[PDB]
């Protein structure tokens, strides 16, 4: 999940603060690759 | 050996300086609202 | 479009040629299916 | 004999058989090799009513299992609320640690349980105790990112 990546930890800091991943990104579930948008009528789609 | 290099720097400074290199792009996707400007962002090339 | 286009500017003009055919072809396009990035040229953010 | 024959029953969920097997004299304390009661089973897996028929018959609430932990870890670290309640109610040590010095509390805080927290910290819960790396409930919650259990 994005939460479990979330808290992935980077750095143990010096003062021993920890560098979670969610402290350094922002982390969603996307798609592979952003190049092709389609659409159906105007609306998001996808297909076959 | 007068200048302290091995094959083994050698080796690696071809595979380190005879390289191509996935740059991705600006203006890639996906991009930012209003981005105006998209081009392939080129880095390294194999020697010729 | 030009070179360079990005894919919100194709977007637009994908929008009117859908808009296009949902309104002046209201009798006879039953739906149109917008693709933004590959065209029969070839791929890119400047085809559809 | 029959103390085999009951912590299959007590897994399966299996009532009467449970009923007719503690009227067969099985004993309630059995465990197998990783030292998990019907009671454990009953815990882990959410009969309710299997741990109500087996603490009546005796049960005991609070065994642990080869690395120590307790049916009240396996209810509150798995969300049965009603079995989380109904064994603290019947005795079961809301604070006790495992071989890793981990609580019900730490299990509950863990997943992000907030019912069964709270019913742990009404029984006295220890806030503060420490598994084995120094970490307390709240640590867990802030790493979880729970604003809610924090």
């Not at chain 4, 067969?24 to 990783?34: L, Q």
Request: glycine share 10%; proline share 3%.
């Amino acid at each position: 999940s994005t939460e479990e990546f979330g808290k992935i930890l980077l750095k143990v800091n010096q003062d021993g603060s920890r560098v979670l991943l969610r402290d350094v990104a922002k982390i969603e579930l996307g798609g592979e690759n952003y190049d092709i948008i389609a659409e159906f009528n105007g609306q998001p789609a996808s297909g076959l | 050996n007068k200048f302290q290099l091995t094959p083994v720097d050698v080796i690696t400074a071809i595979k380190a300086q005879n390289a191509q290199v996935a740059a991705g792009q600006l203006g890639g996707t996906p991009p930012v609202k209003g981005q105006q400007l998209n081009a392939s962002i080129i880095a390294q090339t194999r020697l010729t | 479009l030009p070179a360079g286009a990005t894919q919100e500017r194709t977007q637009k003009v994908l929008n009117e040629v859908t808009h296009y055919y949902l309104t002046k072809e209201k009798n006879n396009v039953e739906s149109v299916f917008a693709w933004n990035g590959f065209g029969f040229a070839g791929r890119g953010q400047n085809t559809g | 004999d029959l103390g085999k024959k009951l912590l299959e029953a007590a897994r399966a969920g299996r009532d009467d058989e449970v009923r007719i097997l503690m009227a067969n004299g099985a004993d309630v304390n059995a465990a197998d090799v990783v030292g998990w009661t019907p009671l454990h089973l009953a815990a882990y897996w959410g009969h309710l009513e299997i741990v109500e028929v087996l603490l009546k018959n005796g049960a005991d609430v609070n065994a642990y299992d080869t690395l120590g932990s307790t049916p009240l870890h396996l209810a509150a670290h798995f969300g049965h609320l009603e079995i989380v309640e109904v064994l603290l109610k019947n005795g079961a040590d809301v604070n006790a640690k495992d071989d890793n010095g981990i609580t019900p509390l730490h299990l509950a805080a863990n997943r992000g349980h907030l019912e069964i927290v709270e019913v742990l910290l009404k029984y006295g819960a220890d806030v503060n105790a420490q598994d084995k790396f120094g970490k307390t409930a709240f640590d867990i919650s802030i790493n979880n990112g729970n604003e809610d259990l924090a």
